[PDB]
Amino acid sequence: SLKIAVLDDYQDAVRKLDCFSLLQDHEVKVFNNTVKGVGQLAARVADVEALVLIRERTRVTRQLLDRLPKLKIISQTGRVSRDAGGHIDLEACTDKGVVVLEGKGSPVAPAELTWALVMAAQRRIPQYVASLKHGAWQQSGLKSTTMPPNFGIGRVLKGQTLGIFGYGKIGQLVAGYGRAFGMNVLVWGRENSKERARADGFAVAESKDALFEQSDVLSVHLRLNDETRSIITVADLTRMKPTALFVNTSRAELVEENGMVTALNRGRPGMAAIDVFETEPILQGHTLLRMENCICTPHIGYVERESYEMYFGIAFQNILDILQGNVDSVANPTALAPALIR
Amino acid sequence: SLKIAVLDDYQDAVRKLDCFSLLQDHEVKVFNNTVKGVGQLAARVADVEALVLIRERTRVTRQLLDRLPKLKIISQTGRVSRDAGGHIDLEACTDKGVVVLEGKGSPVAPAELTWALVMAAQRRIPQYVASLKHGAWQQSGLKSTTMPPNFGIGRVLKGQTLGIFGYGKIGQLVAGYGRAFGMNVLVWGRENSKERARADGFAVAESKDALFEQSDVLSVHLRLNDETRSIITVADLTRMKPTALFVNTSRAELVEENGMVTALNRGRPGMAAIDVFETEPILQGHTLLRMENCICTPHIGYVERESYEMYFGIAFQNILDILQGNVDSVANPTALAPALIR
Ligand SMILES: [Cl-]
């Protein structure tokens, strides 16, 4: 019987999941807000032996682990990144003999979310809905002199060009949606992405430059690492059409710092839809939130009922499996060794 | 050279269209708001000989035409309905010698808008967007105590049931989007609609009861006529699951008056997304508009760039064509016979 904490559950959804009953033999506290800074966070989880993390919402540093003597298990919803950086210091965990348990993820919820944003942006749904609530009939704004003529009006997807930057599992689903809407789908990425795209019957853009020039909607599906940090520059974005939509439900740092705000202010692309920010949560506003030609959602790509059932079901079962000596989900198995060999 | 007026163009889009230059030899006035008063409407359009209407935005009554001696042409964007309802009194037009020109429609823009609402509603996009703008991180604000658990978080489409009521051109497209997202499509309608659906590979409902009970998302795709008017009752809607979404982008009058409000207030369906209203424009104090579980858009289904280019292109060409004697677009051909014979 462990003291378990689940962090960063803003809408208090975790405790209402069918899978929550998996932890019936344990004492579970779910927190509904985020605390940053080592001191306050260590005091909040001082007695917990098992910590459940929601994706990358909280980072686990050596300095945090120094302040947590009772911690035995970190159970990660979704994948644990082995690369430099990563939101969990695995070596520091291994040093304390804290096991990190790895879950599994799914591309479906964030792919559908990507498309929901494509459709919402191209039809100016948030803008029209908000205007209507304030009494303005059929008004979406977007009528500035710097903007294209009739930019406030909806745009059809059929027969337009969809650029897909990155062809992993999410990119592949979203490319499929494009095809089913009758869009002209072009893919770009590393060599193996191009190969899998060609095998799937998708056209590959001539170059990265060609992707940004030609796309009416450009959507980014890349994992963040040293190769892809700042891979999208202001030069790339300002190559985009004045009527073009830039979509990013991946990671904010894929675009060079302030690059997006900068490009929107220069009028190319014409619109953006984003789900991810450099700093989260955003409680005190953001430049992009005050722009009528940006639609921003609060990192809801994976916030979905079936996704939570699967994600937490696995993270909770992982804790149960470890307590029975099944250590298959351990990311850092050398933390199981005695302190003498550690 | 005729005096032409275009009515009800709220965002002043018509004059910025490429097809607007078809009327370069004429005097065009475009109005940007709606007057319904027969006296105020007559005074606006007192000197014009050609009237271009935007779908059903303005009603043309006998008592309107009586107050308009100079009017010769009514050019309709989209189709002209010969139904007992009908927003134009075609008989009055004939009696006054006014020719009514019928245009052509397209299912693409309203089908894509339907899907945009399905996705916006299922991921609670406007709710999350508006909350974020107000400083609430990852709150959809669906704060009812009688809603299903976790109803404030998003829901994937994959694996869910898509109910389609009516299988014309728009329903066929929406069914195709359902299939593309991995939904189980369920089609209901008249025999020939059900037959076309089975041939297209879709499951069909055995009864209207089955359609309302089994759908997770239910979308209505019927034309309004003597049989489909008030075809959806409160009793239909309260057969829907408390987790279900009802979508209506077709016509408000398919649903019995106050039926949707009543049903939503009784928790069944759990949510609605509605593009069409009994009286348009609506007022800010409209009942549905106040509801957190109703996403309301201001009849934007056909308000789209390519759609406007197509619809107005045809309507403007129709005017040009009848001025040169080509009268194929005339819906009331007997209006062309001499006043003494009328
Ligand atoms: Cl319309």
Side-chain angles (χ1 to χ4, degrees):
Chain A
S1 178
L2 302 175
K3 218 258 183 196
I4 297 171
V6 185
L7 294 187
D8 313 307
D9 177 21
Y10 310 99
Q11 287 173 278
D12 203 21
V14 173
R15 77 176 168 87
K16 301 157 188 161
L17 298 175
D18 292 346
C19 72
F20 197 72
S21 186
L22 292 171
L23 300 175
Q24 56 178 203
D25 191 38
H26 307 279
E27 180 187 325
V28 189
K29 183 58 209 277
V30 182
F31 295 95
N32 307 133
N33 54 40
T34 301
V35 153
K36 304 230 167 186
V38 186
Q40 286 179 159
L41 185 54
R44 226 78 182 88
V45 298
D47 300 319
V48 342
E49 308 156 76
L51 204 49
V52 180
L53 298 182
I54 308 183
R55 295 305 307 124
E56 304 224 337
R57 296 185 188 167
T58 287
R59 30 182 43 251
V60 169
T61 64
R62 189 175 286 274
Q63 13 283 131
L64 178 67
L65 296 160
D66 289 341
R67 287 191 186 45
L68 297 180
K70 314 221 171 309
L71 184 62
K72 296 188 266 217
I73 294 158
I74 295 158
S75 194
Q76 184 57 57
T77 54
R79 74 203 270 275
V80 184
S81 67
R82 304 304 212 273
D83 77 319
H87 80 106
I88 306 167
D89 192 341
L90 296 183
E91 271 51 55
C93 286
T94 302
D95 285 349
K96 305 278 191 300
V98 171
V99 294
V100 174
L101 313 188
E102 178 164 37
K104 295 235 161 178
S106 169
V108 181
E112 290 195 3
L113 192 271
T114 303
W115 207 254
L117 283 177
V118 172
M119 301 204 88
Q122 287 305 69
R123 289 309 279 263
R124 294 87 168 91
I125 298 184
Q127 301 93 333
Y128 271 118
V129 163
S131 285
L132 185 56
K133 277 158 144 283
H134 279 128
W137 177 260
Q138 200 170 107
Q139 299 290 346
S140 53
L142 305 155
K143 49 184 174 73
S144 156
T145 40
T146 60
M147 281 166 186
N150 284 352
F151 197 51
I153 247 80
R155 320 186 100 262
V156 62
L157 298 176
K158 184 181 192 185
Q160 301 271 277
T161 300
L162 176 63
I164 300 301
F165 196 166
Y167 196 77
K169 291 177 200 162
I170 304 175
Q172 171 171 12
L173 290 179
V174 175
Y177 301 152
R179 197 105 294 181
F181 275 76
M183 302 190 79
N184 185 44
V185 185
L186 301 172
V187 179
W188 203 78
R190 291 172 295 105
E191 174 60 22
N192 281 146
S193 288
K194 297 170 166 176
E195 289 180 19
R196 292 190 266 272
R198 295 193 184 104
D200 283 348
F202 288 103
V204 168
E206 290 210 345
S207 56
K208 184 179 158 191
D209 298 7
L211 192 81
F212 283 91
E213 283 162 347
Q214 288 179 99
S215 301
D216 298 292
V217 170
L218 193 155
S219 185
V220 189
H221 303 285
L222 300 169
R223 296 274 160 193
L224 188 57
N225 55 46
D226 291 321
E227 284 69 61
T228 63
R229 188 178 304 270
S230 309
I231 199 170
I232 297 171
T233 65
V234 180
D236 294 320
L237 293 170
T238 53
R239 212 111 50 175
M240 294 184 70
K241 307 179 189 187
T243 51
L245 167 75
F246 178 74
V247 184
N248 187 10
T249 62
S250 287
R251 288 294 302 272
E253 299 93 341
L254 296 175
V255 184
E256 72 174 335
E257 187 173 21
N258 308 320
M260 145 125 294
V261 167
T262 302
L264 286 171
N265 283 341
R266 310 221 277 251
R268 300 164 89 100
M271 188 169 295
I274 65 105
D275 184 59
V276 289
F277 294 84
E278 290 87 1
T279 294
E280 291 169 12
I282 299 278
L283 298 188
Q284 248 66 253
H286 195 277
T287 300
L288 282 181
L289 300 188
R290 305 187 288 279
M291 281 181 249
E292 68 169 352
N293 58 332
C294 201
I295 291 156
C296 306
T297 48
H299 204 164
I300 54 179
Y302 299 86
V303 188
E304 181 277 313
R305 50 142 205 142
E306 295 196 19
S307 182
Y308 267 29
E309 289 289 359
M310 181 203 282
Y311 277 68
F312 294 90
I314 288 162
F316 296 166
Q317 196 54 52
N318 282 347
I319 293 167
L320 308 188
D321 290 338
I322 255 77
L323 297 169
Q324 297 277 350
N326 174 344
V327 288
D328 296 349
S329 69
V330 184
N332 61 337
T334 67
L336 291 163
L340 293 162
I341 321 182
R342 286 199 276 111
Chain B
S1 186
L2 308 176
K3 214 298 200 296
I4 302 182
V6 184
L7 297 189
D8 314 304
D9 180 22
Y10 308 100
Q11 286 169 106
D12 201 50
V14 178
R15 72 176 218 207
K16 297 154 190 147
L17 304 170
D18 283 287
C19 72
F20 193 63
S21 202
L22 287 176
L23 303 181
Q24 62 185 143
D25 297 337
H26 305 270
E27 279 193 46
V28 197
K29 191 72 216 311
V30 190
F31 296 98
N32 301 140
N33 64 6
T34 288
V35 283
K36 294 203 185 171
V38 191
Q40 292 87 51
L41 185 50
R44 267 200 180 175
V45 79
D47 301 304
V48 340
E49 313 151 67
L51 203 41
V52 177
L53 301 181
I54 309 192
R55 302 195 72 252
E56 332 269 292
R57 289 185 201 175
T58 278
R59 218 139 204 96
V60 171
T61 55
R62 180 174 287 280
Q63 75 176 75
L64 177 64
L65 297 163
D66 287 356
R67 289 178 187 52
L68 299 168
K70 294 187 192 176
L71 186 65
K72 299 189 258 282
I73 299 162
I74 292 172
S75 199
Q76 186 61 75
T77 56
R79 69 174 98 266
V80 171
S81 66
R82 312 290 200 274
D83 299 326
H87 76 113
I88 311 164
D89 198 342
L90 264 64
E91 249 64 286
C93 283
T94 304
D95 297 345
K96 256 52 72 67
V98 180
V99 283
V100 175
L101 320 183
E102 190 173 18
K104 274 138 196 186
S106 158
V108 185
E112 291 190 1
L113 193 267
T114 304
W115 208 250
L117 293 174
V118 166
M119 295 201 82
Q122 299 296 84
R123 292 305 280 264
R124 288 83 168 105
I125 289 197
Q127 293 101 333
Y128 273 121
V129 165
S131 299
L132 175 53
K133 276 179 174 278
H134 284 103
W137 177 261
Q138 212 177 85
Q139 300 293 337
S140 57
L142 281 164
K143 47 185 179 61
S144 160
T145 74
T146 52
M147 296 179 341
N150 286 345
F151 202 58
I153 76 178
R155 299 183 82 86
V156 282
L157 297 181
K158 189 184 178 179
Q160 301 281 288
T161 297
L162 177 63
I164 297 292
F165 196 170
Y167 198 69
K169 284 181 231 293
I170 305 173
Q172 283 162 43
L173 286 185
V174 170
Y177 304 147
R179 184 190 56 217
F181 279 77
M183 306 188 76
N184 303 119
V185 180
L186 187 61
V187 178
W188 171 256
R190 307 171 326 245
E191 183 52 35
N192 192 238
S193 293
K194 288 176 69 179
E195 176 74 19
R196 284 194 315 260
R198 288 185 301 262
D200 287 344
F202 303 116
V204 296
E206 68 269 17
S207 56
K208 188 202 221 178
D209 187 322
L211 177 80
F212 280 84
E213 286 192 329
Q214 296 160 207
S215 300
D216 296 303
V217 175
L218 203 163
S219 196
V220 188
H221 297 290
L222 299 161
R223 295 283 162 175
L224 180 67
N225 60 48
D226 303 331
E227 295 82 39
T228 67
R229 188 175 300 266
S230 281
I231 200 168
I232 295 175
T233 79
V234 198
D236 294 319
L237 289 166
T238 63
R239 278 184 272 280
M240 300 193 56
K241 306 182 190 181
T243 53
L245 169 66
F246 176 79
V247 187
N248 189 11
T249 63
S250 300
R251 294 295 288 272
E253 294 89 354
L254 302 169
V255 186
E256 288 181 352
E257 197 179 48
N258 318 313
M260 180 78 278
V261 166
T262 302
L264 287 175
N265 278 330
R266 294 176 186 177
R268 305 186 64 168
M271 193 170 296
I274 269 98
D275 186 56
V276 287
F277 307 94
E278 309 275 349
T279 289
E280 294 168 10
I282 52 174
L283 268 305
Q284 195 176 356
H286 189 278
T287 319
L288 276 183
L289 197 59
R290 303 262 287 187
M291 300 192 163
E292 55 168 45
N293 64 332
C294 195
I295 294 186
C296 298
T297 49
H299 205 165
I300 52 172
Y302 292 85
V303 190
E304 185 276 311
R305 202 200 54 76
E306 301 195 14
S307 182
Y308 267 29
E309 290 288 351
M310 179 181 173
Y311 282 52
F312 287 98
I314 292 171
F316 296 169
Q317 194 58 60
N318 280 356
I319 294 174
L320 302 187
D321 281 350
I322 73 160
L323 286 183
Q324 305 302 310
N326 181 2
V327 285
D328 291 326
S329 71
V330 184
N332 54 340
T334 70
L336 286 160
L340 283 163
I341 276 81
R342 305 198 305 263

